[PDB]
Design a protein around this ligand. Structure first.
Ligand SMILES: O=C(O)c1cc(C(=O)O)c2c(n1)C(=O)C(=O)c1cc(C(=O)O)[nH]c1-2
Ligand SMILES: O=C(O)c1cc(C(=O)O)c2c(n1)C(=O)C(=O)c1cc(C(=O)O)[nH]c1-2
Lengths: 253, 255
């Protein structure tokens, strides 16, 4: 709990220290990294994360709508170009849709968002809803869990080949595409964070912002655990069909 | 599930709403345990602490609906929801009462008011209700209240089962559950009238059913989060620290 303002460099080490709570340390992730995860578990994860992926562009749009600095928008929109892809077959979102195929799910399995668990949907929407209401700097800097993302993206490129041979070749792309896209992201991220967070007030609060971002990732996995590892999906005492809501209600009729 | 193809009458539509009661959180194992006498004190306290986050969002959510509602006649009625929870004169209202339930289960007012024990999973689910009331049209947002149709039964279940299983819970903690037997029924009188007048086509009736399902998923995910933390010894970050490390602030409302 910072009393005396930290410096552009001491604050960078408070930020990265929050990587100790990153979702790499979540049993659900730990079981995937070791090969103990089943087919249904890996599928649920890819389909649920696709809600997270198709949201990033929304959220970055929302930041841009809140940010009147032309120069900052000129950078930040590359995050959107990245995920939507310039034209028809490219994208981080296509590439995920591909990673779906490569674990034996259709495109429609994903695009339908039918397998997206409410616990996941709520965690993720809270990211969006934050980006919509907060001042753009804060929403922008909440992206900074991209710091820790390279290491976890590699973590999968290593171990899924050996411990999960059946995962088609061309899905590993996204995780690859990201080893760089996230180091560029963060380079803006950090210059912003380092710059804007120029007092003790703003430092403490941005740390709490980051915890929130971390809480979201953790809760996404928590709903995945309950459903796919523990045989405890929504309404399991009442039925074994999927009964949860499946539509982004406010965005679409 | 089911689907409507041909616009149901008002009265038939009401029953299709009531059939969603099969998916109420009274059927969550976290509630069944508490109901049966197999909950721990830690579990009851955690539940009480976490549900306070829901109680204090109710008036925010209702105030959002009112902000989105240009019909003064509907606002004259809806605002009573906020008077019920906020109280008028001081140590009255739902929120205070829920504080007294906190006390009755061995917690201090401050344990609740600090919001330090509100699990991120609960907060995200409760927050999604608020966010929906803020953005959706007022009628849809008002109608998402109608899980209240099922609430008197759940409140009665606690009143019926908790004294025998947990007699260390003080009598005065039951006030809230009791007060809602009637407030939930007044509430639902209006909500049903609204649903029945507004949902007058098939598209709207199906969309309402999905809105009610969304509400139902909120309540269920709240308890999922409580399960992970208080029944499965799996609170956020349990593999790294056994300190509470989640964020504890409504970031968009307060510093
Ligand atoms: O696979 C991962 O564990 C992981 C984590 C995160 C993160 O830490 O927020 C992102 C991504 N992937 C990712 O693919 C991505 O595009 C992304 C964007 C952001 C952001 O906040 O703008 N985080 C993340
Ligand atoms: O204890 C319960 O199971 C329960 C459930 C619900 C519900 O169904 O949303 C409410 C309450 N309690 C309650 O105490 C309350 O004041 C309340 C207001 C509302 C609403 O949506 O506007 N739901 C509920």
């Amino acid at each position: 709990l910072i009393t005396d303002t930290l410096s552009p460099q001491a604050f960078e080490e408070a930020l990265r220290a929050k990587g100790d709570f990153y979702h790499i340390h979540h049993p659900y992730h730990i079981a995937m990294h070791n090969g103990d995860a089943t087919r249904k578990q890996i599928q649920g994860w890819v389909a649920n994360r696709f809600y997270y992926q198709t949201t990033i562009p929304l959220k970055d749009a929302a930041i841009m709508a809140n940010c009147p600095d032309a120069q900052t928008r000129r950078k930040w929109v590359q995050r959107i170009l990245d995920h939507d892809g310039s034209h028809g077959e490219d994208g981080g979102i296509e590439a995920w849709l591909r990673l779906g195929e490569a674990v034996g799910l259709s495109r429609d399995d994903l695009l339908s968002e039918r397998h997206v668990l409410p616990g996941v949907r709520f965690a993720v929407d809270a990211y969006l809803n934050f980006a919509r209401r907060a001042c753009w700097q804060e929403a922008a800097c909440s992206s900074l869990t991209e710091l820790f993302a390279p290491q976890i993206h590699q973590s999968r490129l290593d171990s899924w080949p050996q411990h999960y041979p059946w995962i088609k070749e061309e899905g590993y792309f996204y995780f690859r595409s990201r080893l760089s896209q996230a180091n560029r992201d963060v380079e803006h991220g950090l210059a912003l964070a380092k710059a804007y967070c120029d007092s003790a007030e703003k430092q403490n609060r941005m740390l709490e912002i980051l915890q929130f971002k971390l809480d979201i990732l953790w809760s996404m996995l928590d709903a995945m655990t309950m459903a796919y590892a523990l045989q405890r999906p929504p309404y399991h005492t009442v039925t074994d069909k999927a009964a949860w809501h499946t539509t982004r209600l406010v965005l679409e009729h």
